[PDB]
Write a protein that binds this ligand. Structure first.
Ligand SMILES: CC(C)C[C@H](NP(=O)(O)CNC(=O)OCc1ccccc1)C(=O)NCCCCN
Ligand SMILES: [Ca+2]
Ligand SMILES: [Ca+2]
Ligand SMILES: [Ca+2]
Ligand SMILES: [Ca+2]
Ligand SMILES: [Zn+2]
Length: 316
């Protein structure tokens, strides 16, 4: 909408107060004009019609319980935009500052979030498995990263290419969580998962097997559920990424860690310069080796550690 940029204040899903960029024209709208061609947050009103209504508020204060998922979807989209711009010199998901749109309050009891080809969408959860999913900064960044992938490598959402697609979203979701630096970890979705159980998460990158996901190519799933296990076999690549950053010895193979920033540079370059819609795990290894070679040199520790990490997870 046309209006003037304003700054509202509200409370997110976890009860924390934050400022949000809004736009005033009769109402205050969740429209942040400070980033690219805008970040826009919509109310889906418990229905499945998208996007719903651009979020309108009478007084620029967002402390109602119903407001909390919108506050966080809007704010964390801003953090994710900032990460891509400041760290990778990428302007929004398409590289040309496309408007970023999210809808909250999607459906009833909806234990998921997704990119629908055009926008982000967040359920409220059923209160048992999830609380409103925009409360997780790693979740928000996971979803926006699907848009980045779709505009760049274009990894098809099935089988190995789809597991790479998933892992890319978990990797950058985690790197955005570290960027914001509030309780960062290598777990996925812990802030919105199972409010009655402490210490768990949807997936672990540091130890995928904690939740039954494979941590070695020999343990990959090859059935048809979950688009050929895209959220399962992602564990193999998540483990490799964790090892590249943090190091460790895994199935007897020792990996020298090189840290998160270099992990992110290597995988961002792989995603945007080398991967294709049909890349498999072996082709990802080659892309990551080439990316590290471009950035750090063929004889570098970074290249050697990429090779060790993929060796550790059984990917040649
Ligand atoms: C980070 C997690 C909290 C959320 C994360 N969701 P996602 O983005 O991977 C789901 N996208 C998805 O299907 O895209 C395909 C698609 C394409 C066009 C249109 C629509 C859908 C996820 O791990 N879900 C699995 C666990 C959900 C437990 N009930
Ligand atoms: Ca209000
Ligand atoms: Ca965390
Ligand atoms: Ca996390
Ligand atoms: Ca929990
Ligand atoms: Zn995903």
């Amino acid at each position: 909408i046309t209006g003037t940029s304003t700054v509202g204040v509200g409370r997110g899903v976890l009860g924390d107060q934050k400022n949000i960029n809004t736009t005033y024209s009769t109402y205050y709208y969740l429209q942040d004009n400070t980033r690219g061609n805008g970040i826009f947050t919509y109310d889906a009103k418990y229905r499945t019609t998208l996007p719903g209504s651009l979020w309108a508020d009478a007084d620029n204060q967002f402390f109602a319980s119903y407001d909390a998922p919108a506050v966080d979807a809007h704010y964390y989209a801003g953090v994710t935009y900032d990460y891509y711009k400041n760290v990778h010199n990428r302007l929004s998901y398409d590289g040309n500052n496309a408007a970023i749109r999210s809808s909250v309050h999607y459906s009833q009891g909806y234990n998921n979030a997704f990119w629908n080809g055009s926008q982000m969408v967040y359920g409220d959860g059923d209160g048992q498995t999830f609380i409103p999913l925009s409360g997780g900064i790693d979740v928000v960044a996971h979803e926006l990263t699907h848009a980045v992938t779709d505009y760049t490598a274009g990894l098809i959402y099935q089988n190995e290419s789809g597991a790479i697609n998933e892992a890319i979203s978990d990797i950058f979701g985690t790197l955005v969580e570290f960027y914001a630096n509030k309780n960062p970890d290598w777990e996925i979705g812990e802030d919105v998962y199972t409010p009655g159980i402490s210490g768990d998460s949807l997936r672990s990158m540091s130890d995928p097997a904690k939740y039954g996901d494979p941590d070695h190519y020999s343990k990959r799933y090859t059935g048809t559920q979950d688009n050929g296990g895209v959220h399962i076999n992602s564990g193999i690549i998540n483990k490799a990424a964790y090892l590249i950053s943090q190091g460790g010895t895994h199935y007897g193979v020792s990996v020298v860690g090189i840290g998160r920033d270099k992990l992110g540079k290597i995988f961002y370059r792989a995603l945007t310069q080398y991967l294709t819609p049909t890349s498999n795990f072996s082709q990802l290894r080659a892309a990551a080796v080439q990316s590290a070679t471009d950035l750090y040199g063929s004889t570098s520790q970074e290249v050697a550690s990429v090779k060790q990490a993929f060796d550790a997870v059984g990917v040649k």
